[model samples]
Target: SHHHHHHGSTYDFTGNTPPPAPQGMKWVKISQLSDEFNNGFNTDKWTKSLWNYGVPVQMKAENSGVSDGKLWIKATLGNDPERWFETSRVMSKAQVNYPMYTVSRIKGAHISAYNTFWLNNGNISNRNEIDVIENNSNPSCNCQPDFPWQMNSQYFHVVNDDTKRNKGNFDNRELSDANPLKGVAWNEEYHTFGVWWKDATHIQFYLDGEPAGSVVSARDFTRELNIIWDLWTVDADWLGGLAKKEHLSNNNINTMKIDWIHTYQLVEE
Candidate 1:
């Protein structure tokens, strides 16, 4: 698209061209992300969390809220007294298999607290996963004004349980190279991210209309997956830390803002 000029050869990744489709392909419309939060989030599309893989703390229902046409998942202090942290996570209620496309517009949280946008099937035993965007670097948390915001977006594909079992080391079947979000900043504004999954073997990633990268099949399963957006913190070593000091300095509030999420069924040409 004219809007995403950065995805030109200068960025990175293979198959920079948009995914190819059959001559009769058409785009089937799915629901767009919506907020009926006053009545509570859409249970037909999502459910609140308990705990998840990347998060180091429990997921709490109270940490999520909706207002002003936006859905905000929070990471805050006092929500978990013993652990010194609390955050919010939610998963798509509908089962979204591959051979599809998805996109969401978001404003991310700071370091010490991070956000993830991805797709997941069942847990390790029966898993099929696709990560469209993830920011693990804590420095992009809007804490340091002197430096330019560094956005690190990556991809992951996991097939069956045993392969996922060897979790600590990805063995080259689980990840995509990184893309530096050239002109974007986390909290300063909103940006749109999208993905096109042709099947279990091919998927493309996009940021603000530019192709960030693409991944060929690297998973071992074909379970139906769900869309997910979550905000959580980990110990400092990985991405950021529990961020107690950062939280205290910033007034105990960390949030990931979502404007909307929409999915489309690819029609065969």
Candidate 2:
């Protein structure tokens, strides 16, 4: 049982435990976009994404659930041969715009699947994505040897295309400044990841209540993006490749856990 504690002492977070806002700014909780997962999966706040394209794995509602004060998403081998891995994708029903901050405490899966927390508008013609954290705690491939100890963050700007092919089209940054749990694997302990959409071009990221990095984009991010949490895998080497049958067969190693997610709108103090 991991004990939860507040990160800062300047503000009084009596009932909630969101990361402290930036200097001279306060965080007003956005109830519709936040969840503690204490009462199971609330339909009013989140919707299961059933799209089966783009990725090799199939997204199914049965692979996700809420229990033991946490939301868990599992990736396992399916009966079908085409998409052997079955996973989950959950998205916020309500979309949020700029000047917003969101944080989540999560434990990555010790498998090939990517335990991801991100935001996107789902636009094919004008694509915009903010990938807060995409972690592969146990990468079996040599292409990503350092992924187990790194925090990968990226944002994409694809116009008239679904992928990032053009130069300077996306900013992919990986942070490895001091591991979250020192000598422990990412799947062994929970860590908090946060993103502050400060404005159109300024975006900042946080790890365990501290600033990890920031990105200044060439294009303005002005779309109303839906918050998403998903467990998925690709067949590429950089994406940790495909999950092994032995790893997916064991439920103990193929599940990602989310303690809670809290969203806030920045307000000037």
Candidate 3:
């Protein structure tokens, strides 16, 4: 049995089994970086971003809340034309490093906005990002036609290349006829997205407990990163275009739901 009857009980791993740990290594829950969101939004564990930046949306505290055993982020049409959409961005107070695995159960909002789960850190000289998943439920408005059915996993880091200051590498998987979730939209149901930071240069991504893909970066991801969940959209097609006013008006289709977030570290058995 995976359950441990100690002073601090291990979270039951009955049906929601995590990805297996590396050989000879065991998994230990990291409570500081995990939340079931059963009680309410814990300010001690998370902080809502109010940085009036990124895309054409405002990140307000009022857009997020915990209830009904889950966390929900709402996106709505705002009065301002420049920052027409209002959404939420929440980050963990504690940071996490490599040799660990993190997973979250999420359902994307049925709008054009990008519902994202990611980890990021550093400044211009050594900045890095690991995108666990960026899902856009209403992909018909997406600028890139091919991205409509793709599950995106990506990494970004500062680079010396002249063309751009930072380089982004993507490992996106398609939901084709061979894929088990061929026709289902991302907003249709909840799904698990996970990432195993195996080492400084190698990382693995998982979808619903199965291996989705991996990325080997040229730069080492040595810096610890903060866990983030946010929702926003841009007017450009690349960022899924701006959310439709009609869609944003409807509360039912304008929210992103997160069932839980769990983090585990690898230790010697």
lDDT of each: 0.59, 0.76, 0.75
Model 1 over residues 16-132: C-alpha lDDT tens digits? 223445577876656633333444477776788677544356677887767667788777665345555667787777777666877777777654565778787666555666766
Best by lDDT: 2
lDDT score of residue 70 within candidate 2: 92
Q: What are the candidates' C-alpha RMSDs? A: 6.8, 5.0, 6.2
lDDT by residue (tens digit), candidate 2, 1-269: 36434332332223134555679988798998988899999999999997874546889999998999998998888877778788888899999988998988899989987788999985767867888887887877768766776777878766766454211111112323333344345687887778888888777777665566667766777688999999888777877877786888887898999999999998888
Model 3 over residues 21-48: C-alpha lDDT tens digits? 6689898998988999997999888999
TM-score-superior candidate, 1 or 3: 3
The ten-residue window of minimal lDDT in model 1 covers 165-174
Task: Give the TM-score comparing model 2 with the true structure, all chains together.
Answer: 0.85
Between prediction 1 and prediction 2, which has the larger TM-score? 2
TM-score to true structure, per model: 0.73, 0.85, 0.84
Candidate 3 similarity to native, TM-score? 0.84
